[PDB]
Structure formats: structure tokens, C-alpha cells
Design an enzyme around this catalytic site. Sequence first.
Site, mmCIF file in Angstrom:
data_model
loop_
_atom_site.group_PDB
_atom_site.id
_atom_site.type_symbol
_atom_site.label_atom_id
_atom_site.label_comp_id
_atom_site.label_asym_id
_atom_site.label_seq_id
_atom_site.Cartn_x
_atom_site.Cartn_y
_atom_site.Cartn_z
ATOM 1 N N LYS A 14 27.461 88.663 43.638
ATOM 2 C CA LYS A 14 26.315 88.520 42.749
ATOM 3 C C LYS A 14 25.201 87.686 43.333
ATOM 4 O O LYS A 14 25.409 86.534 43.739
ATOM 5 C CB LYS A 14 26.725 87.863 41.444
ATOM 6 N N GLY A 15 24.008 88.260 43.356
ATOM 7 C CA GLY A 15 22.881 87.521 43.877
ATOM 8 C C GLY A 15 22.135 86.979 42.680
ATOM 9 O O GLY A 15 21.794 87.746 41.765
ATOM 10 N N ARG A 16 21.892 85.672 42.660
ATOM 11 C CA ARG A 16 21.168 85.062 41.554
ATOM 12 C C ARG A 16 20.146 86.122 41.116
ATOM 13 O O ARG A 16 19.733 86.192 39.949
ATOM 14 C CB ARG A 16 20.492 83.759 42.028
ATOM 15 N N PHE A 17 19.789 86.981 42.064
ATOM 16 C CA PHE A 17 18.856 88.075 41.845
ATOM 17 C C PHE A 17 19.613 89.379 42.113
ATOM 18 O O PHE A 17 20.196 89.549 43.197
ATOM 19 C CB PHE A 17 17.723 87.973 42.836
ATOM 20 N N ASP A 134 14.566 79.984 52.353
ATOM 21 C CA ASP A 134 15.791 79.878 51.552
ATOM 22 C C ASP A 134 17.046 80.011 52.420
ATOM 23 O O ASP A 134 18.007 80.680 52.057
ATOM 24 C CB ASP A 134 15.814 80.933 50.425
#
Length: 301
Positions: A14-17, A134
Site C-alpha cells: 500500500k502506497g500512502r498514495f 522523498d
Amino acid sequence: TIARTIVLQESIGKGRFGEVWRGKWRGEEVAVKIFSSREERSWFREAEIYQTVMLRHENILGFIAADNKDNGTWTQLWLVSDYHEHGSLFDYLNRYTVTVEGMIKLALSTASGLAHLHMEIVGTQGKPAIAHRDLKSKNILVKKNGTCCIADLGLAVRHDSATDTIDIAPNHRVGTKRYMAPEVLDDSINMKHFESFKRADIYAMGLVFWEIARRCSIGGIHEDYQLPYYDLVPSDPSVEEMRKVVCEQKLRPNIPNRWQSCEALRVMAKIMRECWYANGAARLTALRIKKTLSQLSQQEG
Ligand SMILES: c1ccc(-c2n[nH]cc2-c2ccnc3ccccc23)nc1
């Protein structure tokens, strides 16, 4: 023709996005990142960074394609890349400990990767410089052969040398606060000078080296996996909490005195310190780190 011929098989992370799926294209595994619609504020951008530039490097996630599959029924914007089973470096380090060799391999690959990202090649078929903004354990992937490749270039920034301007990114969210360099935490960074972004990238990479080295197991001795500053800030730290620790107290991750009983860890430790200077202008460059790590690589094999 592309997204259309791809079959999703399993959720890889899961990507924070958005998030990622392991798909199958013409008999091969492939990673696919699908955008949550409102998350489009990054689909085009991430596609752009991976494309508009001549970013092909063994240490940068190999980009396959971008396909607007905005379902005649709903929103499906795809990002297709190579697939690396091991997943993120974060996952890797959390599950395994590493040899001295592995540690160098990991740290060198990462450095050569960011070195390429940062390198400008002026001219006809040139290449603009790129700062990640990032860099962190979770945005770096480890390949089968034990080397890394930078990923999640969604928040990157491209420098237009021709006009010394910066092709800003169109989004509403900066980076991970835990890895933000000092000048970014106290908001003193001159976001108008591209070098500052590369300098911030560097401070962040030193933290990642710290995470790797803690897992280098020799004589059976190593430390458990821990994120930078696990001993000074809560999970999901706020800018304020990081700034007091990194800027006011002037505290950096701890370097075990034992890391000097081994040449490779003595070097890594030196690079770390030289990446954590409050003054970005005094930090090592990614090219420089690649060189010293390269030299340490041949020596080891
Ligand atoms: C398209 C598809 C995926 C991604 C991706 N974003 N962050 C990590 C990966 C990843 C990229 C390649 N292999 C992986 C394997 C496991 C987990 C994440 C990944 N980006 C664009």
C-alpha cells in the site's frame, strides 16, 4: 494495448498514495500502480518524471508504461513498471539481516541510483537533473541480485539548466517528515536553488545507510531494524517534533562505536556523518559517495 493486456494477480503493498499490484504481461510479472482518482494529482506527474527524462539506469525502477484506462464505468489510471519480488528496502531490512558484502551492494546501488538522478547532461538528447524530495527506505526497492533501484519518483523536481528554473511538481503534499533535512524542517531551505534539493536528498540517504548498516550482521552481532529517530520521535512524526530533535537539539541517529571494528562499517559510518551536516553545502555529493563505496567494493570483491 498495454493495460488492456495486463492481468492483475496480487496486492504487493500500500502506497500512502494508491497501492500496488503484481500483474502478468505476455508471460512476465510486472508491477502496476493504480491511482485513487483524487490521487491523480500524481499520476500524470509520476508518469512525466518517469518519461520526459532519459532516466534509464539499472538503479532506478525501470518504467514500462502509463495507460489512461479511465473505465467507461470508472477511474483507472495505470503506472506500469518492472516487478521486484523482495519489495521495498524497508521490507527487506525488516525481514533479513545482511552480510558486509550485501550492505555495500545495497548502499552503492542506492548511491549510483541517486547519482544518476542528480546528474545533468546538457545538450541535444540531454537529461535534466532530478531531485527526489522523498528518499527513504520505503521508496527504494531491492532486486533479485541484491542491488537497489530508486522508486516513487512522484514528488521529484526537475532542474531546467537552460533557464536555471525548476519544473515544479503539481501536488498538495510534501515529503515524509521523518527524513526531512534540517533546512527543510526549519523552512530555511532556498527552494529556488536546485542544489538545495540534491543536498536534502543526500541527508535523507545517510539515514537510509544507517538503517542498512544496523542490519549488517558480523560475528552474529547486529541491531534490530529501526527507522531513523525511533528513539526520539513518535510514529508519524510532525514537523514540530522533528525540528526540535534535528534542528534544536542537533541530534542525529546513533552510530554504535562497534561500527569501527570493521573497515566497511567504518566507511559507511563516515559517509553517514558527512551526509548529516546541518549545512547542506558541506555534505557529500551522491557521485562522491558512489566513488568511495565503489572503491570499497572492489577491495571487498
Ligand atoms: C508502477 C508500479 C509499481 C510502482 C512502485 N511504487 N513504489 C514501489 C513500486 C514497486 C515497483 C516494482 N516492483 C515492486 C515490487 C513489490 C512492491 C513494490 C514495487 N510504481 C510504478
